[PDB]
Design a binder for this molecule. Structure first.
Ligand SMILES: [Cl-]
Ligand code: NA
Length: 265
């Protein structure tokens, strides 16, 4: 009955797998509008229009640090744009603007007959993700655009941890041993500041700052949680409610918190 539900009923194994049900292709954005560079990942056989997610790297970093999310999310039925920023040294506010410019360009390409994503995107259903500075940028994007349907930043950092205005469903990945953006001064104060939204905090046991980046050894769990979150909140897909809201029975999680996630009659 859900017009946004795509794909077969999920299982833990199907969400832990390297690839979801849909075939993925990608292209690099040929004239980036308001950001440095971009790659668009998209499903070729999703069976209806899908939401779009824009993902931003951290300071000094480029698409290669966040690139694993592209096929992982697109293969479950999302259009995903990974960007390079105008400068590798851009700050979170600028990263947010560039993230939203990337979503804008995905909307443009959805209306561009030569684009592979022509007519594939539901431009009313968008999400934001990132790493560190780009994670802070994702939270800024959510604060400034409450019609975004989900946010899932990783190891976030901003100069202000107070994101009390965010009403967007927000999953925060964190890394237990992060020495760049320590959990106790960054990710956790950010999480604690949000009292208005569905939210979740997932800390990877023993993880360094890069514990959710490309090449991490926890792609089964992190990918399951990221996809489940985006499915539940971008698609309103309650087949994913358990996976989205559950505390993982995993030694790969050192700290789990969630609020306002489960539905109550
Ligand atoms: Cl670290
Ligand atoms: Na450019």
């Amino acid at each position: 009955t859900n017009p946004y539900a795509r794909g077969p009923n999920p299982t833990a194994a199907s969400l832990e797998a390297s690839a979801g049900p849909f075939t993925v292709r990608s292209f690099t954005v040929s004239r980036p509008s308001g950001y440095g560079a971009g790659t668009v990942y998209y499903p070729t056989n999703a069976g209806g229009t899908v939401g779009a997610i824009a993902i931003v790297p951290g300071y000094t970093a480029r698409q290669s640090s966040i690139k694993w999310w592209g096929p992982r999310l697109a293969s479950h039925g999302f259009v995903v744009i990974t960007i390079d920023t105008n400068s590798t040294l851009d700050q979170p506010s600028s990263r947010s603007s560039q993230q939203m410019a990337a979503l804008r360009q995905v909307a443009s390409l959805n209306g561009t007959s030569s684009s592979p994503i022509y007519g594939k995107v539901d431009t009313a259903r968008m999400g934001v993700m990132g790493f560190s500075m780009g994670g802070g940028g994702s939270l800024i994007s959510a604060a400034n655009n409450p019609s975004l349907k989900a946010a899932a930043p990783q190891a976030p950092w901003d100069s202000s941890t107070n994101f009390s205005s965010v009403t967007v469903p927000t999953l925060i990945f964190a890394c237990e041993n992060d020495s760049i953006a320590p959990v106790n001064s960054s990710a956790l104060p950010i999480y604690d500041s949000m009292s208005r939204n569905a939210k979740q905090f997932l800390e990877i046991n023993g993880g360094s700052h890069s514990c959710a980046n490309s090449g991490n050894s926890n792609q089964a769990l992190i990918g399951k949680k990221g996809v489940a979150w985006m499915k539940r909140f971008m698609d309103n897909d309650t087949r994913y409610s358990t996976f989205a809201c559950e505390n993982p029975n995993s030694t790969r999680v050192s700290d789990f918190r969630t609020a306002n996630c489960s539905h109550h009659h």
